Design a protein around this ligand. Sequence first.
Ligand SMILES: Cc1cc(N)c(NC(=O)c2cccc(-c3nc4c(C(N)=O)cccc4[nH]3)c2)cc1C
Ligand SMILES: OC[C@H]1O[C@@](CO)(O[C@H]2O[C@H](CO)[C@@H](O)[C@H](O)[C@H]2O)[C@@H](O)[C@@H]1O
Length: 234
Amino acid sequence: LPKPVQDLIKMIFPIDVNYEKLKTDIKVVDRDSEEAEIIRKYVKNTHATTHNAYDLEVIDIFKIEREGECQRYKPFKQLHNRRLLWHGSRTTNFAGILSQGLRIAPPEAPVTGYMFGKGIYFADMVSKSANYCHTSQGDPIGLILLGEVALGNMYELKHASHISKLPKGKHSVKGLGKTTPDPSANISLDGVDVPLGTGISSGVNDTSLLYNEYIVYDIAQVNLKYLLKLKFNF
Ligand SMILES: Cc1cc(N)c(NC(=O)c2cccc(-c3nc4c(C(N)=O)cccc4[nH]3)c2)cc1C
Ligand SMILES: OC[C@H]1O[C@@](CO)(O[C@H]2O[C@H](CO)[C@@H](O)[C@H](O)[C@H]2O)[C@@H](O)[C@@H]1O
């Protein structure tokens, strides 16, 4: 395996045995390629200003295909409003995330900590998701996912709801932030919208959220595309 992939396997845990454990094809993305430049732009432009504790710096970019995930995502790949969005988590979770995919809290679990109910959460501001890696100066390396999310018809909300059931015809929730990546800069990679614009005012002022959130309540609406290794500089 390429050295970057070996260092990734060591981060989240011999090597080839654990790699097969992940049930995931992992490939290194060329630094000089356009995938990489699009991703680095996304990172650079969507760093919120209230998250000035750290600067982000991309170390490695991996293209990942989880086993079965594309065959499971099928019914939503034609779904309009597909979007490439961040998801952060503690390094410890990633072994599981890759082997089993992003999951939903169990049906009988408290909803009080879930601003928009028990679903799978995403941001379009890199720092908003990077906050959920919970890295520090003692461990300034973390992992963020980029997922293709089949948002469909969004239920746009300004305030928490704490339930997991959508109205009919809705497929996702968008928590509306006061700040959103400039839509005039969105680009379409492989049919999927990448909101890599610099943050500008959304025009919403009646809202609880500084930045957007995107929630889906079916694990088949997610197709993990990339995994970034980030250095946090505090
Ligand atoms: C060890 C461990 C334990 C637990 N319980 C969790 N989960 C939560 O604390 C939790 C619960 C509810 C919502 C969200 C949440 N995530 C995001 C993200 C993201 N992720 O980029 C992006 C935008 C909005 C978000 N809202 C997170 C995570 C980890 C690593
Ligand atoms: O579509 C998958 C997922 O969407 C949910 C809500 O998240 O329901 C939506 O999609 C259904 C299938 O098209 C629609 O019938 C429904 O009207 C719509 O809200 C879930 O039911 C489902 O797991």
